[PDB]
Design an enzyme around this catalytic site. Structure first.
Site, PDB file in Angstrom:
ATOM      1  CG  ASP A 134       9.795   9.463  22.778  1.00 34.36           C
ATOM      2  OD1 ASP A 134       8.578   9.211  22.706  1.00 34.36           O
ATOM      3  OD2 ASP A 134      10.557   8.854  23.560  1.00 34.36           O
ATOM      4  CG  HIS A 177      17.272   7.277  25.501  1.00 33.72           C
ATOM      5  ND1 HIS A 177      16.669   6.427  26.404  1.00 33.72           N
ATOM      6  CD2 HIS A 177      16.336   8.198  25.169  1.00 33.72           C
ATOM      7  CE1 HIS A 177      15.420   6.811  26.601  1.00 33.72           C
ATOM      8  NE2 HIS A 177      15.192   7.884  25.864  1.00 33.72           N
ATOM      9  CD  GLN A 242      13.894   8.544  22.101  1.00 37.62           C
ATOM     10  OE1 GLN A 242      13.292   7.602  21.583  1.00 37.62           O
ATOM     11  NE2 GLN A 242      13.407   9.220  23.139  1.00 37.62           N
ATOM     12  NE  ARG A 272       8.130  10.444  35.583  1.00 42.38           N
ATOM     13  CZ  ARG A 272       7.881  10.035  34.339  1.00 42.38           C
ATOM     14  NH1 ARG A 272       8.448  10.633  33.296  1.00 42.38           N
ATOM     15  NH2 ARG A 272       7.045   9.030  34.139  1.00 42.38           N
ATOM     16  CG  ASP A 274      12.389   9.824  32.863  1.00 40.62           C
ATOM     17  OD1 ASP A 274      11.642   9.498  33.805  1.00 40.62           O
ATOM     18  OD2 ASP A 274      12.399  10.979  32.383  1.00 40.62           O
ATOM     19  CD  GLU A 316      10.344   6.281  33.229  1.00 42.66           C
ATOM     20  OE1 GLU A 316      11.022   5.240  33.384  1.00 42.66           O
ATOM     21  OE2 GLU A 316      10.120   6.813  32.112  1.00 42.66           O
ATOM     22  CG  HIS A 385       3.186  11.669  30.725  1.00 40.25           C
ATOM     23  ND1 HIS A 385       3.599  11.435  32.017  1.00 40.25           N
ATOM     24  CD2 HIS A 385       4.141  11.142  29.920  1.00 40.25           C
ATOM     25  CE1 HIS A 385       4.751  10.787  31.998  1.00 40.25           C
ATOM     26  NE2 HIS A 385       5.104  10.602  30.739  1.00 40.25           N
ATOM     27  CG  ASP A 386       3.252   7.452  29.249  1.00 40.62           C
ATOM     28  OD1 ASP A 386       3.150   8.186  28.241  1.00 40.62           O
ATOM     29  OD2 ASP A 386       4.351   7.047  29.669  1.00 40.62           O
ATOM     30  NE  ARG A 504       1.970   7.781  24.410  1.00 37.87           N
ATOM     31  CZ  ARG A 504       3.287   7.606  24.465  1.00 37.87           C
ATOM     32  NH1 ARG A 504       3.868   7.393  25.629  1.00 37.87           N
ATOM     33  NH2 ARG A 504       4.022   7.646  23.359  1.00 37.87           N
TER      34      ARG A 504
END
Length: 625
Positions: A134, A177, A242, A272, A274, A316, A385-386, A504
């Site tokens: 991921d 996770h 995950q 960060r 998440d 995040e 990045h997204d 992406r």
């Protein structure tokens, strides 16, 4: 009782050297009541609470004792709110794409320093799952650098280099996770029920079935995965590899707090955090944004407040701005949770305003931006990045009686070049988000395709305009890697069997160091963009009005094409989001005779004005003198 307040302080004191423990114990006395109240709320009745708490506090003390002198110094010297000062500028990049390795990153520090970067976000670089992982977000060890990227020693060296350049490293901490090959997951798979209990596990489909009635699927597939080795259904919100951590187990809280401090000790200065919405599961709910998730963040913040007070906690959460205030803390916890949150609403509003040539969309966003508590600020950004998630702007798009609605699908289709004539060259993500680099989105690619020098120049104007908005905000404006050079889309991923499924990649190019070498050449694209951004960054750094402690306001102007924001009582920024030159009468808004700053890199004055004429896509910064 082993958990008397006094015995709890003793658990920490038992690990500290009496001679260097004065500062830590003082902060403990200050912050422990809040920490202990939160832990009691979360875990007070758990079967392991009384036996868990004292030994965990001792382990915390042990990690505090190990905090390096150079980091203790930051703890001692950094003032609250340091991360919101006007000389703060951010940069976000992948380690591999930027410079291959952590050592490579260290070698490019002078580049970052010259750009003016004081806050560097390196995307996931900790050891991650073998095979699919991921994009690094399936973490196998929170305490080890991914070997292909470097070692822990390299990280220590990198952060030491960063500190010398006055740069703070931000790292992702994937709280929700782990990868299914994390050591805890492997211990669970080997039959150790203690670690099995680090995750959410069910003997049969009974509870998972019921949870599935109220859960929202992220990847429509499933929220639970049957693991043959354990013969259990494991909670897997995201990918099946995950496993969601079990945050109702205090051992999990303890382990993750320690992992955080151990990262801080290697020189990580900002986290960060998440997937925080998912931290707490409650039967009969969507298991998102439960009150307990914030209580967990409050507890982690208090741990940082005690052991490593120079560290920054960043949410995040990519959500509408109206949903962000809880991250700064509620009630007595206000100012005691996250230091930073992302202003995704402003980001999306910038692109929307540009596509529709409507600055009033931005005016509205600023007018309703949540007030920042003390020691809190925004990350403002243009890309990341997204994909661009348009959904954060759903509320604004509906409009009001005073604000005309707009179409998010129209904006998205514009940027995906789905309507004839468009200058954008983004792509729709598998309202759907938009992939692509800033430069491709504002018209650079299309200008090149058409061998059009005028169109390329207008594209540059748009890029600088979007960044100007971010740069005026209270907090950390964050440059996405290569935007400072107008780096283009990368299409090579389509030819990569492993990456072609992931759109992406379009906007995750490697840094082209040959273009970086052109950043001072005014006759190049890279040089024009870099120089114009530097002009704004330099001005920003010299304006105390832009610090996060100073107000943020909007000034309604009669023309919907325009957008004006104020910082404190001495700064004003005016923008033209159209391709038409437009006048502004400064007296109309009490700004007569304010001085126009040299945003373009030579006028040259600055001088008092009573009116402005803004070029297409123009920016003007003014100061009260």
């Amino acid at each position: 009782s082993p958990i008397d307040a006094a015995a709890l302080r003793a658990s920490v004191a038992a690990a500290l050297d009496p001679s260097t423990a004065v500062a830590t114990l003082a902060r403990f006395d200050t912050h422990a009541p809040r920490l202990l109240d939160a832990l009691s709320t979360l875990y007070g009745d758990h079967a392991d609470y009384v036996t868990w708490l004292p030994q965990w506090l001792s382990a915390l003390g042990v990690v505090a004792q190990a905090r390096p002198a150079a980091l203790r110094h930051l703890d001692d010297s950094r003032a609250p709110g340091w991360f919101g000062q006007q000389d703060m500028l951010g940069y976000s990049a992948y380690v591999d794409r930027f410079a291959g390795t952590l050592r490579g990153v260290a070698e490019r520090v002078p580049y970052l320093q010259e750009l003016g970067v004081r806050y560097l976000h390196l995307l996931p670089f900790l050891r991650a799952r073998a095979g699919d992982n991921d994009g690094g977000f399936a973490v196998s060890d929170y305490g080890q650098v991914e070997p292909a990227l470097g070692s822990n020693d390299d990280l220590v060296a990198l952060t030491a280099r960063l500190r010398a350049a006055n740069i703070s490293l931000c790292a992702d901490f994937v709280l929700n996770h782990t990868a299914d090959d994390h050591a805890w997951a492997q211990a669970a798979r080997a039959g150790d029920t203690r670690y099995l209990d680090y995750y959410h596990h069910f003997a049969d489909r009974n509870a998972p079935d019921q949870y599935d009635t109220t859960l929202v699927q992220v990847f429509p597939p499933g929220n639970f995965t049957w693991v043959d080795e354990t013969r259990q259904w494991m909670w897997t919100t995201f990918y099946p590899y995950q496993w969601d951590l079990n945050w109702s187990n205090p051992a999990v809280f303890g382990e993750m707090a320690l992992a955080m401090l151990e990262l801080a000790n290697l020189g990580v200065e900002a986290f960060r955090l998440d997937s925080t919405a998912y931290l707490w599961k409650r039967p009969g709910t969507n298991c998102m944004n439960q009150p307990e998730a914030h209580t967990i963040l409050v507890a982690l913040r208090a741990v940082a407040d005690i052991v490593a007070p120079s560290v920054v906690m960043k949410a995040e959460a990519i959500v509408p701005m109206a949903e962000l205030p809880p991250y700064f803390g509620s009630g007595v916890q206000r100012g005691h949770e996250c230091h930073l949150a992302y202003h995704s609403t402003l980001m999306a509003a910038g692109w929307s305003a540009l596509a529709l040539q409507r600055g009033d969309i931005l005016q509205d966003v600023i007018a309703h931006s949540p007030p920042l508590p003390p020691n809190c600020a925004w990350l403002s950004y243009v890309r990341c990045h997204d994909d661009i998630g348009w959904n954060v702007l759903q509320h604004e798009a509906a409009g009001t009686a005073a604000q005309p609605p707009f179409s998010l699908r129209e904006v998205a289709q514009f940027y995906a070049n789905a309507v004839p004539g468009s200058y954008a060259r983004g792509e729709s993500f598998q309202v759907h988000g938009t992939n692509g680099m800033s430069a491709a989105l504002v018209g650079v690619q299309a200008a090149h395709e058409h061998a059009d020098a005028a169109a390329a120049a207008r594209a540059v104007d748009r890029l600088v305009l979007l960044y100007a908005v971010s740069l005026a905000m209270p907090g950390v404006p964050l440059i996405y890697m290569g935007d400072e050079l107008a780096l283009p889309n990368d299409t090579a991923y389509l030819d990569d069997a492993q990456r072609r499924h992931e759109g992406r990649w379009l906007h995750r190019p490697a840094m082209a160091w040959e273009l970086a070498a052109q950043r001072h050449d005014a006759s190049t694209l890279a040089g024009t963009v870099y120089t114009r951004l530097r002009a704004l960054i330099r001005l920003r750094a010299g304006l105390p009005a832009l610090a996060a402690t100073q107000s943020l306001g909007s000034v309604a102007l009669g023309d919907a094409r325009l957008f004006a924001l104020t910082r404190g009582d001495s700064f004003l920024a005016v923008h033209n989001f159209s391709d038409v030159p437009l006048p502004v009468d400064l007296t109309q808004t009490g700004h007569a005779l304010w001085a126009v700053l040299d945003t373009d890199g030579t006028g040259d004055a600055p001088e008092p004005h009573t009116e402005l004429l803004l070029p297409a896509y123009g920016v003007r910064w003014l100061q009260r003198r």
